[PDB]
């Protein structure tokens, strides 16, 4: 999970990318209750049982509490429409390990809607069957269930040797790391198929690829991976840490194209594409902040660095690598697509639509 | 207002030191088991429609082992009566307490190898925090003695129930012993107002509660009477030694009262919304053990510590507890030969129809 409590080096502070992210999606959230969201004479959303909604990946706020709270209002705008008033039940999943004290210490004290904490990776069900209305997941699915483990075999042609994540030149490397986001967004797929009611409503976010775009070392969490890597490998050449704890180290993550995307879900077969798209980042005309970015960097990695590589190591490596990325300020201001945060909006098939 | 038990899994902690309270569990599973056989009217019933899932609630759950014990007594035997009926539901177990319950803890210990689909609800239960009619059976164990505030007559310098040079009652101090119980009167009516809109027609409530003994009016005879008992004696040791002040431990009161059997049925009938379907005594099987010590020191201390440390500094729990450890000790023949065991009271009860 990211960092935990509400520091100044946290997740509840350093979160504000994926703040904005969650902004500019409002308008996704409303979109698709307006036009998607089949309320009128359906017994599945009748208003005289909860209305339920699920956030996969919630993390410790305040960004799951702004979202939640978008669904919480249109829904009950729409209802209104049709003179009913629904309770609403919110679910927050996330690993066990999150800090869910923080979360629901957090919890807004003027919140309608009634909350509860649901521990267990998204990868696994977590919910009954049936009983989802509407589910959200964003900025999480890029998280894999592992590091393939392929690409941590010596003696592998897929072992990514000198590198902790993929470019998209590594051919062998970047099929390994897709062959795991197939298996892990399927079973994702599969047990969300399986919670949310038919008609129901699933809105997911992820770090992903332009389209077209082939190199993943051109947007710019390609860059700050591999920007992550070779401040690594001087932490290696000053002696400071050994090659082989760089060369056993991966990030688990993959960010798909919308074509990967839609083949895995066109595969599962249980949910009807209704909305895909990019979404515009409101620090999009923002001069680059290299520090704003390397504390966000470091609040993402924190806990899977440290648990590598000793805590030790996180002064002196973000230090290195705030003056990379103050060397690159023209690819990260100017040069890099600054457009690649993708949007799904799908709709739970009926029994007799498969 | 919030005074949960000790955090963490620590030898402090709560979870490592609740063996008391596994033991009233352990001996409520016949309670339970029978409840469900004779009571919980599966058959042909709607409200219970195994398409749907069975979803039980434990308030005050805290943070284990103890709540995983009485949730999974409560899924098997269900489970049991529903395999009888050619049928099988799955479960969705909350696990409810106050906000600053360390739900980390609990679900981090959450057992790995489960039937049921768990989420943590954090909130007062002297409120609502689930949508109506949607638990089919509730739990509540060593919480409901648990008042939502101390009694305001008894702060009162003014009222012949100010509780000067004590921290709660005997049952001699007529005046303090009423406020208790008015105090308890209105929470738990309010308690039972909240589930009551909760649980469906027909759904159950086992409640286990620390009480008065039968044929006892004297709660200084109890166990926990006792030991409220020495741990004033305790405090107003430490403001003889001038380690705290007169007025802090005037000031000072336990928000607990510990009801007979009447004081229960007497709230139950008034709120009138559900039945008593058993009442009665527990035997505990702790009881032929010999008083530990350290043992009841570290878990009064388990049990106290927040509210201790928010009305004293924390400065104060090292020095208490040394003298509280010796107090226990001069009184070990009373805990062991002279005080009554049998304070363990248990309801079932089932919410009316209309
Ligand atoms: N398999 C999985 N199951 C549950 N949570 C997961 C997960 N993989 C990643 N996550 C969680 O997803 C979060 C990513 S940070 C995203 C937080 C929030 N959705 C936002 O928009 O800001 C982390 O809290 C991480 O623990
Ligand atoms: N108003 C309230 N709302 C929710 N929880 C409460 C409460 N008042 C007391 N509690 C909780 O009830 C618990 C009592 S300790 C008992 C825990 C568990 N049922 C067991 O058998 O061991 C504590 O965790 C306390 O925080």
Redesign the interface.
């Known amino acids: 999970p990211m960092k935990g409590g509400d520091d100044s080096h946290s997740y509840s502070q350093n979160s504000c990318y994926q703040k904005g992210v969650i902004d500019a999606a409002k308008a996704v959230i409303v979109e698709a209750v307006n036009e998607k969201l089949d309320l009128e004479n359906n017994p599945i959303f009748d208003p005289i049982?909860?209305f339920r909604i699920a956030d996969f990946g919630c993390s410790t706020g305040p960004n799951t509490f702004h979202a939640m709270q978008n669904i919480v209002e249109s829904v009950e705008t729409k209802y209104k429409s049709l003179q009913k008033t629904p309770?609403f039940?919110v679910?927050f999943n996330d690993h066990?390990?999150n800090?869910?004290?923080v979360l629901?210490?957090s919890?807004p004290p003027n919140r309608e809607f009634?909350?509860?904490?649901?521990?267990?990776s998204f990868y696994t069900?977590?919910?009954?069957?049936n009983?989802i209305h509407f589910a959200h997941c964003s900025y999480a699915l890029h998280w894999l269930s592992k590091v393939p483990k392929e690409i941590q075999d010596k003696n592998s042609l897929a072992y990514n040797k000198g590198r902790i994540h993929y470019t998209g030149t590594e051919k062998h490397v970047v099929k390994a790391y897709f062959g795991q986001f197939q298996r892990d967004f399927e079973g994702f797929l599969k047990a969300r198929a399986q919670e949310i009611v038919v008609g129901g409503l699933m809105v997911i976010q992820i770090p992903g690829l332009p389209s077209g775009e082939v190199l993943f070392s051109r947007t710019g969490a390609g860059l700050l991976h591999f920007l992550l890597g070779t401040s690594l490998m001087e932490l290696v050449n000053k002696g400071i840490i050994n090659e082989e704890s760089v060369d056993s180290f991966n990030l688990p993550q993959y960010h798909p194209s919308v074509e990967d995307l839609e083949m895995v879900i066109e595969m599962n077969d249980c949910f009807t594409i209704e909305r895909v798209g990019t979404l515009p980042h409101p620090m999009k005309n923002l001069p680059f902040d290299v520090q704003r970015t390397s504390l966000q960097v470091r609040a993402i990695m924190e806990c899977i660095l440290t648990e590598h590589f000793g805590e030790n190591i996180l002064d002196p490596l973000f230090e290195i690598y705030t003056k990379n990325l103050q060397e690159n300020f023209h690819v990260f201001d100017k040069e890099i697509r600054k457009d690649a945060d993708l949007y799904l909006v799908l709709k739970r098939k009926g029994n007799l639509e498969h």
């Open positions: 049982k909860p309770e039940h679910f066990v390990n800090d869910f004290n629901f210490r919890l009634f909350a509860a904490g649901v521990p267990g069900r977590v919910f009954p069957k009983s």
